Structure 1
Amino acid sequence: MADKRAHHNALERKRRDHIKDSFHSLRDSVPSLQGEKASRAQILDKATEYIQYMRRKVHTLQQDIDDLKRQNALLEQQVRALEGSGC
C-alpha cells in the first residue's frame, strides 16, 4: 500500500507546516515584503500592521464618506431646489 510510513499515501507532512503554505499566499499579500524579509513571520509583521492600521484607515475613511455623502446629498437638494426662480 505504501513504502514509507509517515501518512497513508496522502499529502505528506501534516498540520505542522500548514502555515508556510498559507504563508506563501501571504508572501504575495505584501508585495514589498520581498524587500523587507523579516523572518518567516515577515508577512506576519506586516499582516499584523495591515489588519490594524488598514482597519484604522477604513473607520476614519468611511467617516469622511458618510459626512460627504450627507453634504452633496443636501447640497444638491438645494442646488436643484433653488434654480428656477427662488431668490
Structure 2
Amino acid sequence: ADKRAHHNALERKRRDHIKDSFHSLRDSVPSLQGEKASRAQILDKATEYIQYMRRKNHTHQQDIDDLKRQNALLEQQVRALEKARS
C-alpha cells in the first residue's frame, strides 16, 4: 500500500509550494538583484523592508500632512490677500 508514496509525495508538493512561493517573496524586493542569497536572508532583508515601509511611509504621509498645515498658513495668507478682488 502506497503509504510512503502519497505521503513522500505530499511533502514534495508542500515543499515546492515554498521554493516557488519563496522567490515570490525575494523578487518581491529590490536589494537582492534578482539573484541567489540564502532563503534565510530573503527573510532577513525583507524583514527589514517592513521596518522601511512603516518607517519611510508613516513619516512621509505625515509630511503630506505638514504640507496640509503648510497650506493652512497659506489659508491665513488667503484670508488676508484681498477683501474684494480674486
TM-score > 0.5 by shorter chain: yes
The two structures, once aligned, show a CA RMSD in angstroms of 3.9
Q: Sequence identity, in percent?
A: 93
- Spell out the pairing of 1:32-71 with structure 2 (5 A cutoff): 32-34=31-33, 37-71=36-70
Q: Which segments of 5 or more consecutive residues in structure 2 lack a partner in the other structure?
A: none
TM-score scaled to structure 2, two decimals?
Answer: 0.63
The answer (yes or no) to whether the contact 2:26–2:32 under 8 Å persists in 1 is yes
Q: Which moved more, 1:67-76 or 1:3-12?
A: 3-12
Q: CA deviation at 1:23?
A: 1.0
The answer (yes or no) to whether the contact 1:27–1:33 under 8 Å persists in 2 is yes
Q: Which runs of 4+ in 1 moved over 4 A?
A: 2-5, 8-12, 84-87
Q: Which segments of 5 or more consecutive residues in structure 1 lack a partner in the other structure?
A: none
The structure that is helix-richer by fraction is 2
Equivalent pairs, count: 86
Q: CA deviation at 1:84?
A: 4.6
Q: CA deviation at 1:47?
A: 0.9
Structure with the bigger RCO (C-alpha within 8 Å, sep 6+) is 2
Cα distance per residue 1:5-41 (max 9 Å; x no partner): 6339997714334322211212321233137743123
Cα distance per residue 1:23-75 (max 9 Å; x no partner): 12123212331377431233212110101122111111112111211221451
TM-score scaled to structure 1, two decimals?
Answer: 0.62
